[PDB]
Design a protein around this ligand. Structure first.
Ligand SMILES: Nc1ncnc2c1ncn2[C@@H]1O[C@H](COP(=O)(O)OP(=O)(O)OP(=O)(O)O)[C@@H](O)[C@H]1O
Ligand SMILES: Nc1ncnc2c1ncn2[C@@H]1O[C@H](COP(=O)(O)OP(=O)(O)OP(=O)(O)O)[C@@H](O)[C@H]1O
Ligand SMILES: Nc1ncnc2c1ncn2[C@@H]1O[C@H](COP(=O)(O)OP(=O)(O)OP(=O)(O)O)[C@@H](O)[C@H]1O
Ligand SMILES: Nc1ncnc2c1ncn2[C@@H]1O[C@H](COP(=O)(O)OP(=O)(O)O)[C@@H](O)[C@H]1O
Ligand SMILES: Nc1ncnc2c1ncn2[C@@H]1O[C@H](COP(=O)(O)OP(=O)(O)O)[C@@H](O)[C@H]1O
Ligand SMILES: Nc1ncnc2c1ncn2[C@@H]1O[C@H](COP(=O)(O)OP(=O)(O)O)[C@@H](O)[C@H]1O
Lengths: 372, 712, 541
């Protein structure tokens, strides 16, 4: 029941095209991969309050309203927001950060006021304040008076919103600490979601989603590419595919005469991306997520490390039992230990032990190198 | 004889109250007379008196509609007075409730009200409600307006207006805040302090005329965010009944330049011309922050306007200003002086009983399952503020819905009624919510309460007696000190090996006098040294003064006693009223390393050495720690106590925890092998084999030598 | 409400007399200054701790003079729309001028003319310039007196303190016992006080309280009485029993409770205070007493002799010796003899000035000393600073003083070697004086004096205790007596709980002294004596 919602187009040859089976919006859940848990959380927090409001009347509670997503840029926060908004099929008001901040002085508050008022009038509604950090940076970051007027207006609108009105506010921001602290209290953006860079299977899913229209040559090993790409965010994978296609067309350009506006149809129909093109694109590409601390799963078991059986058992006793069997600890009333400190000669494989421990409890892994 | 018991009225009239014949005789009433009944808070109405012999003396019958109107349940108490002046309403406008017009067609007036107003002469009052059974359904109506006002009687000559939009039942409470004292738990001293300074000057203004004084005007509440300051102020205002005006901080600091002053002035003058009144300035710090933060002209003109308005009202009476914030040192100091927020109030995290009260208040409508042990929650949930408790309840309910989601279909917009009727929140949901909760009040210094007595401190009886002499006698018997004219000692200092039981000793000292306890660990001191913390020493002592009596505990004082921090601490200590019971108790491991300046008389002078626990102390600690864990029957702790020489309390805690870890390891291994409900002696033997002293003999002898040198 | 006459003030005879002689005569009797042909001063600047009644003094003077009065508040004037503050100031000034005689009270002037450092705002500069222009142009105008009230003298802009501007300065200090008694009597002229009221005792107990704090104390005591009697009053009933309302009566315990729940803050910063210590609570050191008398009293009380001989009075003195020898009491006695005000600056204040975190500053301290002259500045534990920005500022301030003004700087320390040699040069704290530990007779006198406020069993001679405490600092004797009192009160409380002990007993003193200690180690005393001998040899021909 970690999800309990995902288990069961877009509210819609000619018949299949009409049923969906430059503005091709309303991207459904199929257009997202590698972030199943976060999508499940967002759906659980958005759909149920709106689609089925009678549950909370029956149980007698006020559902939470403030949802805040944060993660490395390019991981697809806006994609998830738009997908959920279009799937729910509710009045969807979209507020950009920079766009609101680009207005004259005094016209950037009225936009927020009218946005929230409209969302109230036409309820149920979903308001997605993308890049909220641009309109509510850290308190010390900005001291301009308008930067305080806008933030105070946002806070007043948010606090006044809390009522029976079926309106949910969703915000996005790459840095969790960038947002003003006052926006993360009760009655405001309380529920928080963290987007982590995808794993091998997630990367394969993203690759399949993006590489479904290219005239790929039959000799393609998307599994190998998924394995090789470590630390590649979804945007990086899209850029990789685009660069591979660019390389293929560049190689084919020898037969193409740029002088003629049109090209021979046979050549235009002979285009095909090969594995070497993907290898070259990987060579050129350059991910950026790893520059900062992020969340990524690891899949190392007690087989890539040899020996250390006693230490393996000690780590098991320390970490695995409380997570897997907290009931017995509650019975005995002894809280589990917090941390552990590995010490020894360099190169002994401490990082591998940490990754194995993380994998055993099926917990995400965060790393902080010395230079950081 | 206006206090009577409440009983269910068998009849089906929304405006009939029955009284005993003897009760009728005592109040000098007649059958059919209309009398005014006032219930809880400021809700009252008028009902037709009826005579019913079966009614007991001092009892009355009122239906559920009257109970809802008067905000009372069965068996409650009300005040009843004669109402012979009631006139006949010449023109009344009433509208139906939306939920009561579900599918009902036709001329609702003729169908429902006309039979209900055929020479019925039912008393009516502004804002009242009444239900009429028409056909096979029931329709509720509300008293939107009446003429003449307020209370009257609907007769044939009356003109009934049934034109208007349906009255939704939701907004009566969702959009309106009507919360009384029943919605506050875990804070009664603070409520008493606020009430005795808000209600008394307004409800009974003649007392201060009689005694010839000007009662204080301003009031400044503060505490961790989410502690219910706004809710407390709202409840007090509603109970008082005076015209309540709210001036939100961000709302006033989010308007065009030159209009915020206009809003403040309008609010203040409007409150002035409707005395008595309450003016609540939520989040004062947002509009009048410390000078170092605000520099633009607008954010200073706003503060100047606020100060002018506040100074201008002290002449006029019957108006009181209530602020709110999270730190005393987060607003312009100019606001805190005579005539501007004289009284200060501090709200701290509630104790176990307060948390239980909050849980009871919040979890009164949820479909809780049978196996709920809210006492267990209160015991486990420590440091959770009321808002965090509400979040915990919401998370538990969400988890319950998620679990039941398997028996629900995402398609369509309706769920089977059987599924809805099966919504039951169980304990597992609450424990999961606790697991996912993220309390943050403890991240900064806050005031709380402790319940440690001379039971969890084994041995060192002479130290207990000395602490009693130093602390209790001044507080409990100040008259004797006045007789001898001796000012009590301010602070104390403890030194000795680490983990010897100092924190709980300070907690016990605070508990004995029944005074709050503020804690300040080493990391907080370092953070204040580096100026990256939102708190400050001045803030700590201001909160301590506000919550007096209090005990300020300074742990790991040596980390910073190596300065600006020490200077601030010394200044705050010296500038402290002697009579105020604010005792500063410090702890350290290197008495020499502590700056000598602190150890001067008039400051943390009284030194006390906390010796390592002895055999009796070890036995007491072992017994106390295992108070919540099954043990092997027949176990003897005397041998362990004898063999544990040189082991401090922390060492014994480590030994017990390791033994429990081995026991649970064996239990889980046996369970997976599929028994082990106790902790056998072999577990303790293994823990001893893998445990040792945490203090070297060198440190012990150095501490003892320093103690002897001080003694000489 | 109006008509706040001089009868609503107390404990401020000197400052009230100054302000009266400075304000009334120019308006009441302008013909005197015509006959003598001078220009009476216009500007007057009152400053002191907040809540000392500055505004009340201004209003009282205005009402008693019976002249046109125009009040200007710094906050409200600064709260107007941009460009309106200057218009308001121009109006106010013109209206005052046209209706001469007039008095102008620019309350909280610091809020509209702050230090030039914190005047970055353009509107602040505009307002300050407008105020300066208005005041400068006022010299033509006659029969107009401007009074300004500010928290500290160093907060306002420096440009406002020149000839033709707020030149005359007045310093308001905390009141003394008589002042506090007068304040209590004035405030408690309507409360239904009970018979057992000892306002004298309250004044004795309450120290450091300003008039506003005393008013708050009275209000809190009345609130406590109302709360106590609330048990006979029901909130639900609208009517209040007439007898119960009349039965209200304030008792001494109410005042003591109010004192307990009070938060005075005047002492938090340096403030001028008055002391009344004579040569009776100080015992021994007779030679030092005579030397200090010769040094301080004669220049002040007998200036004609110095003028005849042309002698330049010594500016300051320095005290050194073991801690706990009563240097502060000696300084207070010296201040009392010349009948001058006393200013105290403990070491933590100096450290705060070094780190620049406290509002007050050395320059402000000496400005207040000048304003309240004659005074006695007292710098305790200078060694904490003479280990320098603060030292240089102090030296500059001390050098730049008018010798005629009776400002005496008295420094106390325990490390005369650690003091900067610069401070000891002529024209500065050059007159060293050693303070030895009390002798047998001195110890007996100290013990007798400390016991004047505590009952004793008859026949409890203290001569044996004094003789059995050789080399004990006065603080140690205070500790011994406090310990004896603690034992006595513990015994009394124990007896009462088990239920006698109305006064201390000799055995209590014996037990208390059984666990006494010598505050000063022998090595430190040896070094002090060695340094004293070294200094003597350098002046002992
Ligand atoms: N499952 C996926 N995860 C991440 N990115 C994906 C995924 N599927 C597709 N993409 C592509 O990744 C890119 C994500 O762009 P998007 O604007 O959502 O990123 P973002 O950094 O979260 O945005 P912003 O902060 O500007 O709102 C787009 O190219 C999208 O097509
Ligand atoms: N006794 C109580 N103490 C604290 N919170 C309570 C109590 N009873 C209920 N609550 C709930 O706790 C939350 C307190 O929110 P509230 O707005 O009062 O907090 P606050 O920190 O005072 O607010 P603010 O400073 O923003 O006005 C609300 O959910 C309130 O319903
Ligand atoms: N002799 C006195 N000295 C000081 N205060 C007095 C005296 N007699 C009465 N009081 C009362 O003390 C309080 C002093 O408040 P007041 O406003 O006069 O002080 P302030 O700090 O000078 O004012 P302002 O805020 O205008 O600068 C008032 O309650 C006044 O009634
Ligand atoms: N059982 C093992 N013991 C030691 N090193 C191993 C083991 N298994 C793999 N490695 C190697 O150790 C390297 C990781 O080094 P690591 O120990 O993390 O460095 P450091 O000790 O500085 O953290 C990997 O390159 C991996 O090939
Ligand atoms: N009287 C006592 N003396 C010493 N330890 C005690 C005493 N009573 C209980 N203990 C146990 O000793 C442990 C030591 O931790 P703590 O008391 O916090 O040490 P400290 O405050 O000195 O750092 C506590 O967790 C507690 O379980
Ligand atoms: N005449 C006196 N001679 C010596 N010590 C005295 C005398 N009168 C009082 N004392 C003691 O000295 C204290 C006065 O403060 P003092 O010793 O000067 O402090 P410090 O040495 O820190 O300046 C009194 O509290 C008392 O303990």
């Amino acid at each position: 029941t970690a999800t309990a919602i995902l288990r069961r187009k877009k509210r819609k040859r000619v018949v299949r095209n009409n049923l969906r089976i430059n503005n091709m919006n309303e991207v459904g859940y199929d257009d997202i991969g590698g972030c199943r848990k976060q999508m499940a959380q967002i759906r659980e927090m958005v759909e149920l309050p709106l689609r089925h409001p009678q549950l909370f009347k029956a149980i007698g509670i006020k559902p939470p309203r403030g949802v805040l997503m944060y993660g490395p840029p390019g991981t697809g926060k806006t994609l998830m927001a738009r997908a959920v908004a279009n799937e729910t099929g509710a009045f969807f008001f979209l507020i950009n950060g920079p766009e609101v901040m680009s207005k004259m002085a005094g016209e950037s508050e009225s936009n927020l006021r009218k946005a929230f008022e409209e969302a109230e009038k036409n309820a149920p509604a979903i308001i997605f304040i993308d890049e909220i950090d641009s309109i509510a940076p850290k308190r010390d970051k900005t001291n301009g008076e308008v930067e305080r007027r806008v933030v105070s207006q946002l806070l007043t609108l948010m606090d006044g919103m809390k009522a029976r009105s079926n309106v949910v506010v969703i915000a996005a921001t790459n840095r969790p600490n960038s947002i003003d602290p006052a926006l993360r209290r009760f009655g405001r953006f309380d529920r928080e979601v963290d987007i982590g860079i995808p794993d091998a299977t997630g990367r394969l899913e993203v690759l399949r989603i993006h590489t479904k229209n290219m005239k790929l040559a039959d000799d393609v090993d998307l599994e190998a590419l998924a394995a090789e790409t470590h630390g590649y965010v979804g945007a990086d994978i899209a850029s990789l595919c685009s660069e591979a296609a660019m390389q293929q067309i560049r190689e084919k350009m020898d037969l193409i005469d740029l002088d003629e506006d049109e090209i021979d149809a046979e050549v235009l129909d002979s285009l095909g991306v090969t594995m070497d093109n993907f290898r070259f694109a990987l060579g050129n590409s350059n991910p950026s997520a790893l520059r900062e601390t992020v969340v990524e799963s690891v899949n190392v078991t007690w087989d890539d490390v040899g020996g250390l059986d006693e230490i393996k058992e000690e780590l098991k006793e320390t970490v695995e039992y409380p997570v897997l069997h907290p009931d017995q600890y509650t019975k005995f009333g002894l809280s589990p230990s917090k941390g552990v400190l590995f010490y020894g000669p360099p190169g002994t494989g401490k990082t591998l032990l940490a990754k194995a421990v993380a994998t055993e409890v099926s917990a995400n892994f965060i790393s902080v190198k010395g230079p950081e | 004889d206006n206090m009577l018991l409440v009983d269910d009225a068998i009849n089906d009239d929304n405006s009939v109250i029955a009284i005993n014949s003897n009760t009728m005789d005592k109040l000098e009433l007649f059958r059919g007379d209309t009398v005014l009944v006032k219930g809880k808070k400021r809700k009252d109405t008028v009902l037709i008196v009826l005579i019913d012999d079966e009614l007991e003396d001092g009892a009355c019958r009122i239906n559920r509609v009257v109970r809802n109107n008067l905000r009372i349940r069965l068996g409650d108490l009300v005040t009843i007075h004669p109402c012979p002046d009631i006139k006949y309403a010449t023109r009344i406008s009433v509208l139906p409730i939306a939920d009561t017009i579900e599918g009902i067609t036709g001329n609702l007036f003729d169908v429902f009200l006309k039979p209900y107003f055929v020479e019925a002469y039912r008393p009516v009052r502004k804002g009242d409600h009444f239900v009429v059974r028409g056909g096979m359904r029931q329709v509720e109506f509300k008293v939107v307006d009446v003429e003449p006002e307020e209370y009257a009687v609907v007769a044939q000559d009356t003109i009934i207006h049934w034109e208007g939009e349906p009255i939704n039942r939701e907004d009566e409470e969702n959009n309106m805040n009507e919360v009384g004292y029943d919605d506050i738990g875990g804070c009664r001293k603070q409520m008493a302090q606020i009430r005795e300074m808000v209600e008394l000057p307004l409800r009974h203004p003649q007392l201060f005329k009689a005694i010839g004084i000007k009662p204080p005007r301003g009031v400044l509440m503060y505490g961790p965010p989410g502690t219910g300051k706004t809710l407390m102020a709202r409840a007090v205002a509603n109970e008082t009944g005076a015209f309540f005006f709210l001036i939100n901080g961000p709302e006033v600091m989010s308007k065009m330049a030159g209009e915020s002053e206009s809003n403040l002035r309008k609010a203040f003058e409007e409150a002035e011309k409707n005395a008595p009144a309450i003016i609540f300035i939520d989040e004062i710090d947002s509009i009048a922050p410390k000078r170092d933060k605000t520099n633009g002209e607008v954010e200073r003109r706003v503060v100047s306007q606020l100060l002018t308005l506040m100074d201008g009202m002290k002449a006029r009476s019957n108006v009181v200003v209530i602020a709110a914030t999270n730190r005393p040192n987060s607003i312009d100091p100019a606001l805190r002086r005579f005539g501007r927020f004289d009284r200060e109030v501090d709200i701290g995290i509630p104790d176990a009983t307060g948390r239980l009260e909050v849980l009871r208040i919040h979890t009164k409508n949820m479909k809780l399952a049978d196996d709920v042990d809210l006492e267990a929650l209160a015991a486990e949930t420590h440091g959770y503020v009321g808002a965090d408790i509400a979040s915990l309840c919401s998370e538990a309910a969400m988890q319950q819905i998620r679990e039941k989601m398997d028996l629900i279909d995402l398609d369509e917009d309706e769920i089977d009624a059987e599924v809805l009727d099966s919504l039951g929140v169980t304990m597992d949901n609450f424990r999961f919510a606790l697991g996912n909760s993220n309390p943050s009040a403890l991240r900064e210094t806050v005031v709380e309460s402790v319940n440690v007595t001379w039971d969890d401190v084994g041995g060192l009886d002479e130290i207990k007696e000395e602490l009693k002499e130093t602390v209790e006698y001044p507080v409990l018997h100040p008259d004797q000190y006045t007789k001898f004219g001796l000012s009590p000692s301010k602070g104390v200092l403890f030194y000795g090996p680490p983990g010897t039981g100092k924190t709980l000793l300070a907690k016990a000292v605070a508990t004995e006098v029944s005074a709050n306890f503020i804690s300040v660990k080493g990391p907080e001191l370092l953070s204040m040294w580096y100026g990256e913390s939102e708190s400050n020493i001045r803030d700590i002592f201001d909160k301590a003064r506000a919550a007096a009596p209090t005990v300020v505990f300074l742990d790991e004082l040596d980390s910073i006693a190596k300065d600006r921090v020490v200077n601030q601490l010394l200044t705050e200590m010296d500038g402290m009223n002697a009579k105020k019971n604010v005792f500063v108790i410090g702890a350290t491991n290197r008495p020499d390393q502590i700056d000598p300046a602190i150890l001067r008389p008039g400051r943390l002078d009284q030194l006390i050495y906390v010796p390592l626990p002895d055999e009796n102390a070890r036995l007491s600690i072992l017994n106390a720690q295992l108070r919540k864990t099954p043990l092997e029957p027949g176990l003897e702790l005397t041998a362990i106590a004898k063999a544990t020489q040189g082991f401090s309390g922390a060492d014994l805690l480590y030994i017990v925890q390791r033994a429990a870890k081995y026991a649970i390891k064996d239990s889980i291994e046996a369970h997976r092998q599929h028994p082990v409900p106790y902790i056998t002696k072999e577990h303790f033997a293994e823990a001893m084999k893998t445990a040792k002293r945490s203090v070297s003999d060198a440190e012990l002898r150095r501490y003892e030598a320093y103690s002897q040198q001080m003694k000489a």
